[PDB]
């Protein structure tokens, strides 16, 4: 297993933490809780070339929660720059995040990601998104919410860091799960927890799943 430092940058509210959380746990966080400085989370993918680990430095986009700023970029081996296709300012600021990033990390693979393509009223049109071309960035339309192109940024970076263009993500092996007997001194503990859970509504009952 090899490990690579990935730095994730972009304006506040663009979906950086939401995107990482979904990759870590599968969960979709609807609330906006601004990152304070950086959160570091190990993220592992299974490839036809073995497991790859990203040490993901999810940085703060809001100036006032910025912390060490470019201090987070030191010895990064790859990067995602994030904006929100529903907010023009977030794309206008992409050149500023790229500037600060490449001044510290001169020769690293970088994906530009336009998040929230699930939202119908799109403000940053395909026609407008050209910044990546002269800067040799990979570009993907993504949605952390619909999972549109959800795996693409990491698959592309994995291909670049390992130096194999045919690297594929593969099904992580599935061990036989253990059999158990319910512990009779938690019987009364379980009917409770299960009562709260039956009477708490599932989110987003209008979606396809």
């Amino acid at each position: 297993q090899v490990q690579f430092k990935l730095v994730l940058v972009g304006d506040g509210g663009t979906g950086k933490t939401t995107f990482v959380k979904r990759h870590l746990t599968g969960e979709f966080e609807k609330k906006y809780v601004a990152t304070l400085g950086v959160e570091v989370h190990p993220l592992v993918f299974h490839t036809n070339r073995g497991p790859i680990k990203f040490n993901v430095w999810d940085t703060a986009g809001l100036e006032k929660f910025g912390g060490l700023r470019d201090g987070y970029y030191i010895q990064a081996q790859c990067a995602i720059i994030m904006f929100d296709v529903t907010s023009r300012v977030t794309y206008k600021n992409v050149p500023n995040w790229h500037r600060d990033l490449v001044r510290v990390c001169e020769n690293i693979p970088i994906v530009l990601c336009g998040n929230k393509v699930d939202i119908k009223d799109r403000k940053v049109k395909a026609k407008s998104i050209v910044f990546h071309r002269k800067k040799n960035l990979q570009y993907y339309d993504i949605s952390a919410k619909s999972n549109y192109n959800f795996e693409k940024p990491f698959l592309w970076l994995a291909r670049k860091l390992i130096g194999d263009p045919n690297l594929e993500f593969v099904a992580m092996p599935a061990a036989a799960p253990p059999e158990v007997v319910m512990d009779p001194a938690l019987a009364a503990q379980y009917e409770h927890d299960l009562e709260v859970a039956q009477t708490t509504a599932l989110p987003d009952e209008d979606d396809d799943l």
Partner: protein, 994 residues
């Protein structure tokens, strides 16, 4: 123990800092996190900069030195001008010395690029503060220190690159207009010396890393320097020969030559034209001899992704497209430049075959520019015949589905242009691609889909007669394909492609009624195939064909007993029997499109009556039961049938608009009774079960009924032609049914769709229902404001719909706000300012627009007590609220409308268009003009809000603002200058004279 460095009452244990930093960068989990928090508090300590000197001398951890330079950066950019001159010269000399030192130790130069680069940027921040007024010798000294050492010379090229970026590329948002111009003019004055240095290094050569750093700086220079530095020196030749031959210099040289291709150049000068040709010839010759010939398989190379090949190939596409888009006419007139012109285009053909969507888009933008030119420019297309033939194949093999709207649009336009230029070549390629689907050699779902999308894209380009033979040939071949293919999966794919192509060829269908009838009857057959995608495609194709060919369904065609719309409606139960509800609604929508073509009223109304027969009978029984036994509404299945009846009405009303009235008239009274009855049950259930009831399937089903009812009424009223009937028949029962039910439900039971429906009512007929608008406000205003004024998050739909409703009421029925009691009018001002403070662009923008429109509404009233009371009560609330969101840095998306609002408010006072004094008596000499008092109020307000500003800065800023309050672009400039200056100490007040 790590928390020791935060204890500033003791001297800094450097070795402790180095452990904290190490733990942060190299550590894990709980330990990494504690280091993170500690380092952040250390860096943010306002005195931390005093420790920088110590850290840069005595730390062995370059990560610690990096963070020291971050701390120094915050001082230099924010508080620099508070320091005595001697202290500023001390820091400046310390930074220079540290840079020269690190550069003179080969070991540290090689290994510590992060810390050196960071030092160079720190130096450039000092130059932005100090240079040239307090450092006129910086450039001569840098030029001098360059000849002393290769390492220092290379690093001086990094400093000059960063200086050029900071002054030319990133100055616009980070500096005042005046300071940007000062630094630009300053770099312009000394560029001659800088260029001499860069040219010498590029001529005398040797060290690759030095040559690359110099070329990196030249790329930045090219954004702003005059052309003569490129065209009147050897440099064009060096770039286009020497530096293209070595792979270390090739990437940067190509990026330089791309920007050279964008220089501002004289257009009427033969020598410069020849020079522009020569550097292109040289560059392409170097590529053909040192990298790859014209024939090379760039698809294969890019895919193999060896070294920097992907980047180089991207950069080559950017160079060829940029140069040819500006200069290809230079290469077109001259027999001797024909080979160069076609080779450059042949390289673009090869680049266009690379499997890389973003690179493909770059080449496709060029191809669009070229084929557009060849369509209109005389005597040009014959040059490009073999290029265009290859491009036809590349576009056809890369056609994406129309769902990818920008890429499909780009590809279609290029293929349409290419089809016009040679229709026979396009036809031959498409028929032969089809033959290789039939012979199995190229067969796959992707490949038949791609080809079908391509064939569809060129509809309208051929003559009607050529199109006729082509389309018949394609439909026959695709049928052959389907029969030949085994198993429902394969047959469904080809049947969908048949449906797709037929749908894109309406001109053929309109001319061949026999064939159109067959197509529709075949789509009806397919509406009984449960195989996934077939019913959706049959329904989508039905409505698409109808949208284009509707006239042919509404007339009696030769040899038919009746208009075909009659035949569709007669068999509708059987046709739609196996469809899902959304498919049934599409079908009925399509029927509504046809019926709206019938302009005989009696016949339209009868067709509308016949189409709505099944939903109307299902409705009549469900109302002849629902009322006679109110229990039948609790049954899951009845609620689904009712919601689907309403949805069928919405679908038909969407396509028919004004023509829908008689159908709305049939159900309107019972529909509003159903709305009341369903509301009752929702209220009941929430009482019996709790707020959780709103999450249950049963209550969501009931609420769906209410929402589709509100959607039906908003759909009709938004397209209605007879507004007298809207006002006299629809509005009163609607308001009686929906307003009190909204007001008297708990927040979690209120449908935001009510606000949306009312917005459409006020929009279309607000001017005719002054009393109705008052009642809408009384019912929704205070109870909606209370839902959305505790935070920025709760009830997001209500939030958005609420400010849309207030916007339209303020536009159409401003008199409703005059009627409000004083306390309610105050809540309205509070509500507008609350909208200003949102980050949600939907709310913020309506908030600022309402504010504009309200000032306009008050201005209109002229000199009367309400307008004079309004200004006394609210003028300073609007000025100060607008300044708050302008200056707080959390509302930048609102800048333009904030500036417009502030400009309007300042201009009112500047033009003496406010009749009363704005100051309460004995607060200023009673003769005093509102202009002098506004100046005073704002000086005082900005002094308390930004106490680090001087009186001179604020007075100069306000003098500029009030002078520029009729020129939005300049006023906006002054505002942005102020936003720069509030972020630092000691900003020059003369900047506001720019």
């Amino acid at each position: 123990s790590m928390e020791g460095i935060l204890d500033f009452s003791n001297d800094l244990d450097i070795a402790l800092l180095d452990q904290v930093v190490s733990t942060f960068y190299q550590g894990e989990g709980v330990q990494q996190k504690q280091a993170q928090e500690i380092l952040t508090k250390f860096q943010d300590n306002p005195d931390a900069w005093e420790k920088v000197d110590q850290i840069l001398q005595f730390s062995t951890n370059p990560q610690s030195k990096f963070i020291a330079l971050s701390i120094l950066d915050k001082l230099i950019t924010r508080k620099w001008k508070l320091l005595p001159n001697d202290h500023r010269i001390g820091i400046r000399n310390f930074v220079v010395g540290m840079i020269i030192s690190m550069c003179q130790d080969d070991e540290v130069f090689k290994t510590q690029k992060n810390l050196i680069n960071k030092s160079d940027l720190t130096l450039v921040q000092i130059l932005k503060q100090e240079w040239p007024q307090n450092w006129p010798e910086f450039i001569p000294e840098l030029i001098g220190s360059s000849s002393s050492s290769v390492n220092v010379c290379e690093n001086n090229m990094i400093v000059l690159k960063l200086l050029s970026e900071e002054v030319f590329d990133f100055s616009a948002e980070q500096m005042t207009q005046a300071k940007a111009l000062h630094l630009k003019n300053s770099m312009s004055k000394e560029f001659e010396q800088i260029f001499k240095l860069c040219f010498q290094v590029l001529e005398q050569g040797s060290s690759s890393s030095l040559i690359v750093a110099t070329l990196e700086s030249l790329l930045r220079y090219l954004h702003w320097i005059p052309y003569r530095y490129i065209y009147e020196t050897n440099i064009l030749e060096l770039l286009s020969t020497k530096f293209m031959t070595s792979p270390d210099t090739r990437a940067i040289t190509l990026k330089c030559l791309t920007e050279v291709s964008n220089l501002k150049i004289p257009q009427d000068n033969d020598l410069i034209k020849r020079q522009t040709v020569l550097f292109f010839q040289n560059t392409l010759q170097q590529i053909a001899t040192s990298v790859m010939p014209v024939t090379a398989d760039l698809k294969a190379t890019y895919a193999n992704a060896n070294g920097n090949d992907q980047s180089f190939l991207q950069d080559l596409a950017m160079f060829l497209t940029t140069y040819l888009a500006r200069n290809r006419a230079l290469l077109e007139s001259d027999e001797s430049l024909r080979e160069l012109l076609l080779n450059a285009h042949q390289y673009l053909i090869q680049l266009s075959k690379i499997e890389e969507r973003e690179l493909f888009k770059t080449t496709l933008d060029y191809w669009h520019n070229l084929v557009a030119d060849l369509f209109y420019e005389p005597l040009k297309k014959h040059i490009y015949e073999e290029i265009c033939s290859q491009l036809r194949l590349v576009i056809i093999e890369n056609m994406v589905r129309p769902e990818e709207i920008q890429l499909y649009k780009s590809e279609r336009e290029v293929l349409v242009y290419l089809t016009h230029l040679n229709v026979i070549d396009t036809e031959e390629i498409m028929i032969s691609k089809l033959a290789r689907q039939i012979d199995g050699s190229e067969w796959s779902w992707h490949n038949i889909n791609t080809l079908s999308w391509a064939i569809g894209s060129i509809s309208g380009t051929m003559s009607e007669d050529t199109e006729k033979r082509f389309v018949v040939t394609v439909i026959k071949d695709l049928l052959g394909l389907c029969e030949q293919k085994r198993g429902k999966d394969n047959k469904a794919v080809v049947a969908r492609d048949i449906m797709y192509v037929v749908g894109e060829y309406p001109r053929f269908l309109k001319a061949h009624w026999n064939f159109l009838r067959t197509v529709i009857l075949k789509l009806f057959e397919f509406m009984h195939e449960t195989h996934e995608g077939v019913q959706d495609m049959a329904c989508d194709t039905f409505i698409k064909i109808v949208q284009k060919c509707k006239y042919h369904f509404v007339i009696q065609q030769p040899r038919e007993s009746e208009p075909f719309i009659q035949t569709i409606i007669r068999d509708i139960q059987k046709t739609t029997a196996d469809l899902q509800p959304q498919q049934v609604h599409t079908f009925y929508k399509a029927c509504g499109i046809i019926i709206s073509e019938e302009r005989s009223v009696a016949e339209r109304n009868r067709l509308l009556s016949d189409l709505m027969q099944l939903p109307n009978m299902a409705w009549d029984t469900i109302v002849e039961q629902s009322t006679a036994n109110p229990t039948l509404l609790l049954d899951s299945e009845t609620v689904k049938i009712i919601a689907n009846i309403i949805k069928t009405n919405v679908a038909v009303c969407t396509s028919m608009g004004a023509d829908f009235y008689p159908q709305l008239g049939h159900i309107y009274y019972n529909m509003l009774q159903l709305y009341r009855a369903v509301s009752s049950m929702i209220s009941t259930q929430v009482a019996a079960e709790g707020l959780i009831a709103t999450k249950t399937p049963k209550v969501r089903g009931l609420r769906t009924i209410k929402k589709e009812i509100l959607k039906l009424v908003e759909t009709y009223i938004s397209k209605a032609r007879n507004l007298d009937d809207v006002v006299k028949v629809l509005v009163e029962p609607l308001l009686n049914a929906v307003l009190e039910d909204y007001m008297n439900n708990v927040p979690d039971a209120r449908d935001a769709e009510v606000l949306n429906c009312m917005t459409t009512v006020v929009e279309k007929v607000g001017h005719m229902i002054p009393q109705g608008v008052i009642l809408i406000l009384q019912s929704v205003f205070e109870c909606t404001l209370d839902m959305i004024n505790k935070d920025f998050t709760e009830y997001p739909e209500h939030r958005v719909e609420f400010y849309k409703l207030l916007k339209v009421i303020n536009e159409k029925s401003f008199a409703a706000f005059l009627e409000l009691p004083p306390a309610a009018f105050k809540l309205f001002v509070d509500a507008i300012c609350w909208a200003f403070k949102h980050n949600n662009r939907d709310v913020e923008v309506n908030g600022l627009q309402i504010a504009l429109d309200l000032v306009k509404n008050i201005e209109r009233m002229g000199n009367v007590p309400f307008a004079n009371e309004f200004h006394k009560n609210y003028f300073f609330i609007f000025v100060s609220e607008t300044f708050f969101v302008l200056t707080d840095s959390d509302h930048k998306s609102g800048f333009s409308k904030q500036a417009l609002l502030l400009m309007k408010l300042i201009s009112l006072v500047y033009d003496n268009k406010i009749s009363v004094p704005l100051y309460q008596e004995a607060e200023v000499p009673q003769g005093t003009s509102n202009q002098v008092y506004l100046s005073q109020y704002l000086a005082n307000m900005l002094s308390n809000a930004f106490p680090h500003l001087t009186s001179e800065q604020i007075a100069s800023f306000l003098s500029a603002l009030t002078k520029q309050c009729k020129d939005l672009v300049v006023f906006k400039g002054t505002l942005r200058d102020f936003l720069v200056q509030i972020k630092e100490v000691g900003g020059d007040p003369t900047d506001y004279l720019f």
